[PDB]
Structures are given as structure tokens and as C-alpha cells.
Amino acid sequence: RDRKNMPGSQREVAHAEEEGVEFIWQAAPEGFTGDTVVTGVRAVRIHLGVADATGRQTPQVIEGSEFTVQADLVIKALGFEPEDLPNAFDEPELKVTRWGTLLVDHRTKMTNMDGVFAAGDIVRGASLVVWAIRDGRDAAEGIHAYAKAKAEA
Amino acid sequence: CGVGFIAAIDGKPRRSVVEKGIEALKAVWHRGAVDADGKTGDGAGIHVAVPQKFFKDHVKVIGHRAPDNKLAVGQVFLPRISLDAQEACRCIVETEILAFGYYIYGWRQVPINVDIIGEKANATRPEIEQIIVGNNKGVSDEQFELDLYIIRRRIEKAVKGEQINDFYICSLSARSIIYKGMFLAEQLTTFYPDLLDERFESDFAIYHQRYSTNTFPTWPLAQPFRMLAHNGEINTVKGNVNWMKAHETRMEHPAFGTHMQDLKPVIGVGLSDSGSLDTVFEVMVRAGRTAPMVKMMLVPQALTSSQTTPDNHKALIQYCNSVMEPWDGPAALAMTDGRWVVGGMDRNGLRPMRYTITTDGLIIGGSETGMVKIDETQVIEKGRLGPGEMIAVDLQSGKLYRDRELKDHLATLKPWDKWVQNTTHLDELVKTASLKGEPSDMDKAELRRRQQAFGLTMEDMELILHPMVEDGKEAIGSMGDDSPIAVLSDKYRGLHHFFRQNFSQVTNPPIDSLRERRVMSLKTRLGNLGNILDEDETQTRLLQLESPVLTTAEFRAMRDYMGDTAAEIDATFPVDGGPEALRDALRRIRQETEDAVRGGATHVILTDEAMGPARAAIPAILATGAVHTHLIRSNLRTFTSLNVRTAEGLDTHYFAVLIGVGATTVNAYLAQEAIAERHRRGLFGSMPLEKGMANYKKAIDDGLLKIMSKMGISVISSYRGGGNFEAIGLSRALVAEHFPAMVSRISGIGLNGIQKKVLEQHATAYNEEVVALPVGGFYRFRKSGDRHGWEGGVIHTLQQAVTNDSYTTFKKYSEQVNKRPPMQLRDLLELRSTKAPVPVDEVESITAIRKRFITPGMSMGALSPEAHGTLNVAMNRIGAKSDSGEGGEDPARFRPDKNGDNWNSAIKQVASGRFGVTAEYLNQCRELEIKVAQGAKPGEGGQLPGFKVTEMIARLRHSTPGVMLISPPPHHDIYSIEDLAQLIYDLKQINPDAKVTVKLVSRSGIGTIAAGVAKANADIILISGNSGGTGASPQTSIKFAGLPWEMGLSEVHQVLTLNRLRHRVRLRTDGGLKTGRDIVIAAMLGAEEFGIGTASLIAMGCIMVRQCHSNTCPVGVCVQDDKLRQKFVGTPEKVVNLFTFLAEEVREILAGLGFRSLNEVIGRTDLLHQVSRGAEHLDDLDLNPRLAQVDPGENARYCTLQGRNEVPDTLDARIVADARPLFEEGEKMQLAYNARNTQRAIGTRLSSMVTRKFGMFGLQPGHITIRLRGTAGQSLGAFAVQGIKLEVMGDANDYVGKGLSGGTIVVRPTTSSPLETNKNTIIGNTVLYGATAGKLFAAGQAGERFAVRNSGATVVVEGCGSNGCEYMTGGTAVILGRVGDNFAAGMTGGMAYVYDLDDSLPLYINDESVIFQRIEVGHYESQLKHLIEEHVTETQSRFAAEILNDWAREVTKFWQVVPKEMLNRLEVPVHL
């Protein structure tokens, strides 16, 4: 993508630039040339359309310009996704969305099943630390309320 | 005025379509003819489906049983005044329905309310009833419909048999019903309360409202019709009816059976064009074809020789054009079969048609895009209909076919490509024809003897024959026609001089031909006529020629192909036959033709080849007329063709009248012999003979196309045998007997006079020993030649009387001019009173009479600035009015000179080109004038040679120096009377103090046109004659077009008096006015003001040199030189003295007559008598049609109202009441309103106030801005000046930005619109017509004729239609999309940029006068970049924004179009 749509902050980008990194914006990988160890990365150059009426740019790969960079060691850092929790925690009744983030109510932060709660990063996605802290505090309050109400009667 | 149709796409009945139809009808009241009564309409109607449940519940209530099948309901108009007519018609209907076996359920009287109808629409109100017929035989639907149609036809015939009047049938079918009447559009649901019911649900609806030219309504004449609805007005019906009269005698189909016999006269009597077309359409549909196929067969597409359509459509169009003659004319059609619903357009695409699809499966189409209220959150696609396009909806399966999909689906039914290959051409045949067998040339003496026999002079060969073979074009003359009319002349005038041509006033637009020459065809087919209700390969097996005119070699090759089936006919009569030889010869030839056609012949060749010293030649026109009429009347014209060999054909007016009479091909061999004889003497130089013949044929075809285009006909097949001429001076008997359809309002010579003339000339040529041809005078004065109106002595004596300032000299002039033998119509009448004379000092003074004279318009392109200024100064000195004519005027002359001599002009013209029309040009006059047609060249545009355009004129007209300027024949703003009313409203809004004058040309049928324009709030009518001068015109249009004003003036007067409309308008006449007697006669005829014209030019120094087009006038009147302008001798006192003498002559004649004022004599026709030339000439001219006196009654015989006729106020009024700080403090403003389609010319009156206050360029851009939300009306922001900014959210209808004068208009869709801005039409047709400055940004596609006659404007639009940038002159235009055929045609200045993804511009552009390349200069790149950035800034578009994002790779997708004349004059050259 472009520079202004970087998902992280922008002070670290300037820091990396000052430290010696070289950046290549709006490029997509196509293949890896080598025999048994990677020797180079063949990539393309894409072009972004104007922002849509809903605020979403649709990129399209340019037909002419495709290049190759010499690479000794490449590191795939695309992203992260939740695991398959119900089929690994032995409980196939935990309600899940499509991507893997389980469903939860807004107030009590209670999972579909009784007694179990879930809040943090597995419910949001690729968030930051402070969001996790807030979710933890809210889930703590909800668990306290539920336990008090249960031992109450 | 308008058509409209609503359809449910899926095909399920519902009340929604009907209620939306009523709503759409309730909002067309602005285009109609508003009346002081408020109840009188001119016709309205709706056409819907049959509400089965309604009538079934009615029948149940009556007491019968509701049947299982569908019902049939017939609506009838019975007479109201009698009670036997009602009973007789009921009896006829009942014995005619029961003869088939169906069951009649009963009659029903429709509930009505007569509270809303006026008087004159109520005196002829018929009795409306309905008859309910049920089907008990259990037949299918198609059979039931067929028997219903047959029953309707037989009932009509039976009722007509008893001559029972006032009877009509509005529908009789099981599928649809029609509610129509003579009420206003909005009062339809009040007269017919039935439509207010809850059970009237349908799946389709058609609605129509008309705009009639007269004020006598007839109820059976209101649309929609049964299976048709028409807007526009058809040209060729006098030719199509005649061809249907020949097609009827062979058509037959097994679907009808024996009953076919009772449909033989398919086109009855008492129908309009929209009735005959409807009848033919219904007959062709009921026999097997579908509505799209019939629409293609009757109104076809324009078959062009380009690669922009698949060959399938080309083969289909070839078949359709081969089987039937088209029905040309402006036509927007909305028709419906029992299954299909079609909306279509004609060939040229003149009327507008816009449609819309909503998410409810609902399509709404009509003439305006804002009739039905619909939110943009419901739309799917907006569109339009180009030339020849159509859109269809299939209700049985519920589908929607656009243009291309319908074409592909229609070109699959039959193998058209394999069928068309049966056609055979003639160039193949003439090439296989060996170069052998050519006969030897005729002798010189024989050629001269044959030429003398027809009266051909050497001036017919050096003036009108040499330019044809030398150049490829026709001759040119530059002065009016002062020759005597044919009957009053004394030499041998050929029979082709008695036929004046036709043209079209406001009711129809003439077809320009120098630019849209691609839609005009001259195809001719022999062996064509046959059964029109068939489909097989034998229907397209014929011979095809590329032009109706044939040479000698081509004629011999075609005679080879014909051969053993053709029959030749003699066309000569013995000179010694006696007093009745010509009639006997006519009888003999018209009997032999019939006896030979019945014998198996299929080709008739009518030759005068045996003309000798004892056999005179029958005039070819009379022969072909008699033969064609007899063949039509004997049911044999459908079998053969008609080929004519003539020896008199030398001018392009001969072939026109011959093909108009009915001939198929014409061969002129004497002209070719003369060409060859002139070539062998070494007169053409070094060109071969074949090149000369090719040039001659090309010139003939171009002139034929010109003559055919004056009326509006674009195909020769529908023009042939229609008789689009008028005979002036022929006997009523001769014309009504031998010619199909022509009117002779004054009868003339019969057959004896023609025989005498022919025999006299033949004897003079063959018994008198000729040695050379006479020089002859017909275009130039010659002593041996013919007489003329302007001779030498008259001119000298007039100039002397004017320059010496003496009256007795002027009376000597009058005595000289009023003593020649009769030469015009006004020479035979005689003044005769019965009162006693009164003294000279008692009549009106010279001032009150001189203020009745004006001078007509004479452009500055023709005249010199000095003469124009002299006329303007002289006419303003005596208090009268002058005229500026076309070509604009000098702004610096807008203030009085220092001698007080004001050089301004009190009358400004709105020409067809709008060459200088701006906002200041219309606010610096007292009295306006619309020019529809000129006296000399009717149905044609003014010309200006390429060397007459100096730098001053180029700056004054905003054009290119050294370029020929030819005005467009049509107006592009006036396509029908409703557009004329719109333009008159525009003109009355832009100038709140002036009057509007309409200028017509005298001809037959002008009375109805005058009664129509008088309802459009016009207050002065001007009737010009045929003898008016001009600056440059072809000789054929000068000598053979128009009629004397004596006819038209009297016709207009009588028709206006008949309709109680004379007391609202004034009448003005001009053309050939020389003396006081002429003015008194014209005043008796009905006129009130008078124009002089050419006589003024003689008073200033012009001596009739007739070399105005050469730019070498010796005196220097019509000149643009300096050498010659220095020789001017004019002075205003000369013109003042001329007018003084002319007025005091009228005083003299009035005082001798017995009156004291011109108001005492106007209209008093009974003071005129007719005396004929004597018992030695015997012309039977009866001018009684000219002297008929229609009694006014209560009203006077002239105008009696004060000031102009004000019009209702638009939204502008409120704006003027709101933007007061702008006019008092002069501060910035910002307004917001809601627009609607019932509001015309938004922002024009404000522009007038701004112009009067600050001027055109006094305010900074964007000083006052207005924001409109909604579909606006027509003429949005017309004549807007700089400092005004209109912003519309929605769309505009038509004529948006007409005549922009520096303003700024922006049109964009709403922000909540789910529409692709580059795929939906936002503005209509004729955008930016004649604009000189400003900017216009739109976010959609435009209609047809986008940016015509642009002069200084700048426009950025996301699309275009056909004929875009036609005849543009200046400015820049950026089109980010596709274009149509004939793009940039006639472009002569400016620049264009097209954005091409399809790489298909070289297929659409007209590479004739413009060049197209790719951008190679950064200077021209900054221009485009800034223009698109401004577009993105204003309209906030998304297409243009994404183009600006990817600039580096899209800059190479643009084509730059630059005119050819602008290749030296560009300042940063386009090349490297």
C-alpha cells in the first residue's frame, strides 16, 4: 500500500529510515527464485484507485512493471489469526464468528456457555495493549458480579 | 404537447401504473396553448388495459352470468343532435356484430361532467357510449381480435354508406381501452370519473396531449390512436397515400380470407397523418408481424456505408427499405401491440425521448424527464433515444430489450443475408456492356434546330451549363427576381416554369444537407412493387440504380437488361391535326399505355424521339402526368415502371418536377449532346468527356438533394409521385384531371393555350431558317430578350428625382412605371369608389404616414458598413424603424453620434446561425424579429463567400477570417410550434420591453400556420413575397421558389379573421413595393405596415449590377474592399426624400379616393375590381379567391391592443424580489430554491436586470449564485451573463445554456444517488446553442447536437450523442466518453479532446474538415489538466478524479481534434 496507510505508528517508520532501512511502497510479492535456498524475490508493482464512496481503495496490479530483488533471507510477516479453540479445548459448543473471534455480550463479557468468560485480544483481533487492558478490567468486573450473584443465591 | 408511456417490466397488472399515468398527464400544462377561457383545450387522451373485474361486476349486477373468458368493450361516439342517427347507428352496430355469432351483453352510458368544457368544444360534443360484447364460441384470443377488427372495419364502411355523419369508434378490442376527449390535460380525471375507481388496474399505459394550429376542435381527431401514439408531425403523406393506392391492388393474406375484400380502401377520408399511419400500422400488425418489425418496416434506420454496425442489421435494413417506402418526418412514437410495448424515434432524431427504470420493475418514458415524481434512491438507469433507436418491453414473458439487444433479437428470425443477395446492380452491367455500338454524333444544324424548338438560348449554356461541367456545382445569382410570372409573359416559357417549389415553415424543420448527407439516399429500384404482406426471397429480386438520373450509355445498358419485355410509346402530335390535336394525342397515348401494360409489359419508355418538321413534341411533364395518373386510376401502376426520355431537360428544376410527378428514371440526351458539342470545340480546356459527364451528374444529384431537403424529405422513394409543388396559372380542370394533388387557387390557361404556344415555337424553329440561337434575357436584361421590372430609364429617373429633391420628377417616374403591360398579380386589379373626392389638405399628414414604413434587414456581411450605417441613420431621423438583419451589429454604435445621428437600429434579428446574438444585443432594441424563411431563398440559409469575411466581420461574428460561412437551413431550436412558443417565451423574458415578430414566406397553407403562431403569443406577422432581393443565392431558388405576397397576405388575413384572432396581431408585408398605388393596394388587402428594401438601395446609388457575390460592386454598396468602399456616394437625405415622396403619393391617392386615413381603408376589399387583359389573350385568371370578404362582426379589422402580450411569470420573479441588496448595494448573494419541470427559463430575467445595471462583464465570476434541487425545466439559464452561477442537483430537460453569454452552469446528480455518473444522461438535446462565453460542467452524458454553433464557450461533459460539435466555431470541448456518427461535422474553429478507451474514434469522426491526432505539446496538456481539475473541483465527480489520479498513463488515451483552416493561425503549433 502507500505510506500514509501504514497500520502501525509513524515514529518507528522515521526511526527505521534514519537507522538505514530502505522502503519499497506499493509492491506485492509474486515468486521466489532459487534452487533449494531462496536466491531472489520476484515482485510486482500495484496501483491504488481513488477512494470509493464507502472509503475503500481497490488496488490493481500494473501489467508492465515487474521486478526482482536480490534476497538472501526473507521473513514472512503478513498477519495473525485465531486458532480453532472449540475443536482444541474439547468443547464444541463455544460460539465463534467466521474469522475465529468468539462471540461475547457487551455488558457482562460472558461467553456463550455458562460460567466461562473470554475477553482480551482473541475477541477483537490485531489490537494494541491498552485495548487488552481495558477488556481485561471489564471482564474482571463482570466475573466478580457474576460470582457474587451466584454465591448470593 | 407530449407523449408518454409507463410499463410494468414483469407484466403484472396494478393500479400504480394507471395512477402514475394520470399524475404524468397532470403536469404538461406549461407546453399547451393557454387560453383566456381556461376551459378550452385542444385534445388529450389515455390508453390503458381493460379492467375485466369492473365490467364483469357490472354485468353481474345487471343480472347475467359473468363468462369465463375475457370481455370485449367498444367505445363509440354517436351523434347528439338527432335521435334517428343514434337509433340508426345502434341498429347498424347490432346487425353487424350478430352476423358473426357473438353475444351482446348490452350498452352502457359513460358518466361524464360537462362542467369543465368550454363553449366551442361543447357545440360538437358527441354522445359517448360503450357496448359490451362477450365471446361464447370459445375461440382463441388471436381469432377473436381478428374478427373484432374485421367487424369494426365493416361497421365503418356500412355507416359511411348511408352518409351518416358524426359517428366514430374509439376502440373495439378485448385487450385495451381508450379514454380521450377535447378537454384540458389536468381535467381528464374530472370529465371521466370512471378512472378514479379502485378496480382500474393495468400493466401499461400510454398518454398524449396535442397542440393544434386552429381553434375549431373535432373530437374524433384526439390521440392516442388504436395501437399508436405520435408526437411530431409527418412530412410525406401526399406521396405515401398515393403509393398505398397502388399497393392495395395486390395485397392479400390467408389470415383474413374473403373478408379481405372489405379492407381494400385502407386509408379512408377525413384522417390526419397520424390517422393514416395508424391505419397502415394496424393493418400490418394484424396480419402476422410484430410491433418492432412493423416499426422497422415503416420508419427505418439510416443505412450508412460505415463499419459501425454488424452486417446483420445492414441486411435487415436493406430488406426493410426494399419492401416499403419510408414515412419520413419528425416522429416520436409510443406504440403497443397486444403483447409488445415499443417506444421509437425517426431517422433524424428530432423530438426528444427520455426514459427511466426503477427498482420496482417499472419503466417510464416520455418527452420530459421530470413528469413523474421519483426519488433517486429508486432509479437504476437513465437514458435517451438516439436517431433510429427503439426500446421494447415484452409483457408476455416480462423482459426489457434496449436498442442493440432488440436489433440482434430481430435479425435472427429470417435469413436476411442469403435473401438480399438476389439484388443486381447496374455498374456491373455497364462494365460488362462492351465499348461498341455507340451512334454517331448529331449534326450541328440538327442540334440547333432541335434546341430552338424548345426555346433554349445561349445564356442557358454559358451561365447555367458551363459551371456545372466545369466545377461540379451550380450557378449563383445575387439579386431578386423581377421577371414577369409565367402566364402574364409573352415569350415561350416552358411548362416547368408554372410549378413553384415547396418548403416548410415552423411546423416542420428543413433538413440541412451539406453536413448530414449520410442520411439522404437516392436509391432507385425497378421491379419492386408487389405484395406487402408477404415474406420470401422473391420480394428482393429487382434491379437497383444508385441515382434516378441516367446518362446515355447507362440508359442503353439498362435497355439491354430490359429488352424483350419493355414497350416504347410515342409522345408527339401532328402539327396539322387541328384545334384539338394535343388532347387527342394525350388520349391516344394514355390508351396505348394501358393496352400495352395489360399485355404483359413491365417497362414503359416514353420518348419524344420522333420529333420532326411535321410532328410537335408533347411537353414531357404533361405526358408523364397523364400516364402516371391513368395507371394509378386503372390499378396497373403496381405492375410496371416509368422511364422518360426528354429533350428539354437542362436545369436541375426539370428533373425535380419530373420525379415529383411520378417518373422513375429520367434521361436527358440533348443536354449530353450539347455538352459533347461544346467539348469538341475546345471550350473546357484539357478535361476528358467522361470527367465532364461525371461532374454534370454529380451537380445534378447535389441540386436534387437540395430541392428535396427544402421540405424535409430524406429519401427519393417517398418523394416520387407525391406532387410537392404548386401550379400558379394553370386551369383547375387540367390540374385536377392530370396531376395527382396540387392546388390552383387561380385557374389559368387550359390545353388550347399550351397547344398554341407549342405550335408557335415549333413553327418558328422549323419553318424559319435559323442560323444561331438568340442571346436571350431571363437572368440579365437584353433588348431582344424578355421584359423586366427594373430597367435603365426607370432607375435613372428615380435617382434623379431623389437627388434633385423634386416631386414632379417623382410623378414622372410613377407614370413611367405604372404604364407598362401587366407583369405581376397586382397589375390587373383596379380601384373604384362610390363617394365624392375630398381635398388634399384634409387627409393625414406625412409624419403619421411615414411612420408606417420600415426597411427590411440587410446583413453587414453583404452590405458595406457605410451603407448600413447610412440606412440606420436615415430611418431613425424621420421617426420610423430600421432593421439590422443577421450578422450582428457594432456595439460601439450603441450611442448617438455627436450630430445626434444615432447609428443604432430599432429592430434586431434572431437568425438561424445566431452569429452575434448576445445578452447586450437583445437589450439594445425596441422591437425584435424572428426570421424563419427569407423571400428569395425559402427553406435555405444565407451564404457569405470566403473572401468577403474581413477581420472586422470575423471579430463581429466570432468566426475565422477567410472562411465561407453558410447558415444552417433549420433552426435547431424550432422543430415544432411548441418549440416556437418556448422560444417566444424566452425572447419575451430576456427583454421585458420589446415585441416579437415572425417572418414567413407566402405559399399555400400559410393560413393555418399563421393561426397557429398567433396562439404562441406572437404579435407581429411579416409576409414576404417571391420577388425579394438577396446577397447570394442559387438561381433555381431565386427563380423557382415562393409565391407572390398577394396570395399569402389575403389568405392570412381571411384565416385570422375567421378564428377571431385578427384583433391581436399586426400584419406587415414587403417585396416589390415601388409606388404609392402598390402601398394602397397592399393596405386594402390587410397589411398595416410596409417594407421597401431594394428601392432604398437604388436611392443610395445601386444600379442593379447583380454582382454582389463577387465583392466587386462598382458603386460600393455591397462591398468589403477599401478601393471600392472609397467610391460610396450615399446620403441619408436621399432616402428621406424617397420616403417623403412615397408617403405623399399615398396621400394623393387617398384624397382622390374619398377617405382621410389609412384606417378607413384597411381590409376594405370591396374597393378592388378585376379587369382582364382583353379578348385576345384568354387567360382565365379568377382572383375572386383573392377578393373574398370575411365579415369580422364585433371586432375591428386591425390591431386594437396596447403593448405586447405579457406571459406568466416563472421562478425568476421571486428571485427579483429576493436579490434586492444586489441591485441596491451591489453585494454578494446566495439563494436556494426548489426547481420543477413546469418552470421554464430559470435565471433569464435576472440576467436582463444585471445587464441593464452593470453590463455583461461588470461583475466578478460567482457574484450571485443559486442552488436548485430537482429536475429543472427547459432553457435553463438561457442568455446568462458573467456574475451568475446556477447549480442544479438533478438534471436538465433541454436547451440548457442556450446562448450562454458569460455565465456559469453546473449540473450534477444528487449526493445520495446510486448511479454511475458516466453512464446516465443528465442533459437533453441542443446544449449550448450559439454561446459566446461562459463555462458549463456536467456530470453525465448529453443528447444530440451537443454544442452546435459554439463560439466562445467552454464545456466539460462525461459523454455525448450523435451530431456532436456540429458546425462549431470557437472554444474548447472535453468529452470523457463515447460519441456518435457525423461528429465534428462542419467544424471550422476551436479545438476538441476525446477520451478513447474503445479506440473507435476514427470510425465515428467526420474526417472532412478536421484532423485528429494525439497530444504532443505540453502547452496543450496544461490546458486539459486544468480543465479536468476545474471539473473535479466543481462537480466533485469520481470518474474525472480517477482520470486525474492516473494522469501519466491516461494522457496517451486522448485524441485532439483541430480544424483544417486553423493550421496556419494557431500560435503554438500542434506539430514538432
Ligand SMILES: Cc1cc2nc3c(=O)[nH]c(=O)nc-3n(C[C@H](O)[C@H](O)[C@H](O)COP(=O)(O)O)c2cc1C
Ligand atoms: C443585399 C440584401 C441583403 C439581404 N439580407 C437579408 C438578411 O440578412 N436577412 C433577411 O431576413 N433578409 C435579407 N434580405 C431580404 C430583405 O430583408 C427583404 O426581404 C427584401 O429586400 C425585400 O425585397 P424588396 O426590396 O424588393 O422589397 C436581403 C436583401 C438584400 C437585397
Ligand code: F3S
Ligand atoms: S446590383 Fe449589387 S453589386 Fe452593388 S450596384 Fe447594386 S448592390
